Write a protein that binds this ligand. Structure first.
Ligand SMILES: *[C@@H]1O[C@H](CO)[C@@H](O[C@@H]2O[C@H](CO)[C@@H](O)[C@H](O)[C@H]2NC(C)=O)[C@H](O)[C@H]1NC(C)=O
Length: 388
């Protein structure tokens, strides 16, 4: 425990007053108020730039953590702009891009920070993409990076959960995000293709289960992004859907990880069937780690069959105060899932609503993650019923 780096990414689970609150565009609130009102969880990290294709470049994940890789979500990037006196960079020198949004000068606003009353210059952009998507910031010169004090990413998951990240220049967590240019190994697909490896390291004790068999665990969650930056090759006299300006493409890992190292899971996870639903229970000490702070529960599933029909819900579970240990649903209704906790026995119960048929052509999948600031538990469930 003592030997783990103290300079990695960390996260807080938050307890917002109004779980129906949303970000309004154009931005009219300071960053901290946006977080207060619309974030259910926040990850802290360092804002870093590399000199790439002749500008200072930052590459940020829309979500640092794995919950639902294929699920679509909406992200809002909000950055603080304040150039030192000696640096001569215009707001128009900053561009950003991300999924669903071409390279562009972001929209700028001025807001008043009610805390200290000070004025603040912010820029923002809205993206639509999966969890694995990226936001890329570009600014020129050697001093351009000094104008961006911090960047907030608010990722609204399919569940409605607000999963946020705050990247500050000179954040203490300097080992939490590392970026380095690497040689491109596969055949080029972009003009002026430039490959970057981004290693995300978070100090959090994570465990992954299938039912109640432990698949993997550790003190540090590590994720490596391999990203190609460059420009789409545009054929003469041809309309292309791909936008102009700089883009990115995801690259595959060098060593294929298309195997299951942990093959000891049952093909159908043990549970209690009631024909109307399957119920799973397990013991956890998670709520004893919470440090008086909430636990965030994210659950999603897919019946298989469908190419990309995902069901997702999220719950905030405070561990002190009114109705403590009672899950608060983040969106209005969660039809597929019910989550309940029995403090006396320290037992969670997950109910999965399912349809009638049961004995053929079924490959349902459910993932439940429950996390505090310092612990996370993921649990995979393999169904032989079709999910509602
Ligand atoms: C690689 O270097 C530069 C990249 O800056 C390429 O020139 C253009 O750069 C501007 C931005 O400064 C981009 O808007 C253009 O997209 C770049 N040109 C093209 C065709 O993409 C330069 O052309 C590239 N050099 C080589 C040999 O390909």
């Amino acid at each position: 425990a003592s030997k783990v780096s103290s300079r990695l990414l960390t996260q807080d689970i938050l307890f917002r007053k109004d779980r129906q609150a949303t970000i309004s565009l154009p931005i009219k609130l300071p960053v901290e108020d946006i977080i207060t009102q619309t974030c259910d969880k926040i990850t802290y990290g360092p804002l870093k730039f590399l000199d790439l294709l002749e500008k200072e470049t930052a590459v940020l994940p829309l979500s640092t953590d794995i919950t639902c890789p294929a699920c679509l979500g909406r992200a809002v990037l909000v950055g603080k702009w304040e150039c030192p006196a000696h640096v001569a960079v215009n707001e128009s020198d900053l561009t950003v891009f991300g999924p669903n949004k071409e390279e562009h000068v972001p929209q700028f606003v001025t807001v008043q920070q009610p805390s200290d009353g000070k004025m603040q210059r912010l820029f923002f952009a809205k993206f639509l993409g999966t969890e694995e998507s990226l936001a890329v910031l570009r600014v020129p010169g050697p001093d351009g990076h000094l104008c961006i004090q911090e960047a907030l990413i608010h990722f609204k998951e399919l569940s409605g959960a607000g999963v946020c990240s705050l990247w500050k220049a000179n954040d203490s967590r300097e080992e939490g995000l590392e970026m380095k240019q690497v040689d491109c190994l596969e055949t080029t697909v972009l003009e002026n293709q430039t490959c970057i490896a981004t290693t995300l390291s978070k100090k959090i004790y994570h465990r992954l289960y299938c039912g109640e068999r432990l698949m993997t665990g550790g003190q540090v969650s590590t994720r490596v992004l391999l990203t190609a930056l460059g420009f789409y090759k545009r054929q003469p006299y041809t309309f292309h859907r791909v936008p102009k300006g700089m883009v990115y493409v995801h690259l595959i890992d060098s060593g294929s990880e298309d195997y299951m190292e942990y093959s000891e899971c049952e093909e159908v996870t043990p549970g209690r069937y009631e024909d109307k639903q399957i119920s799973y229970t397990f013991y956890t000490d998670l709520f004893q780690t919470a440090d008086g702070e909430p636990v965030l529960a994210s659950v999603w599933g897919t019946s298989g069959l469908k190419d990309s029909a995902y069901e997702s819900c999220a719950f905030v579970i405070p561990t002190k105060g009114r109705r403590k240990l009672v899950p608060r649903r983040i969106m209005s209704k969660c039809y597929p899932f019910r989550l309940t906790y029995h403090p006396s026995t320290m037992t969670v119960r997950l109910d999965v609503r399912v349809e009638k048929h049961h004995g053929a052509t079924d490959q349902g999948f459910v993932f439940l993650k429950m996390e505090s600031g310092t612990y996370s538990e993921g649990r995979e469930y393999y169904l032989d019923r079709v999910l509602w």
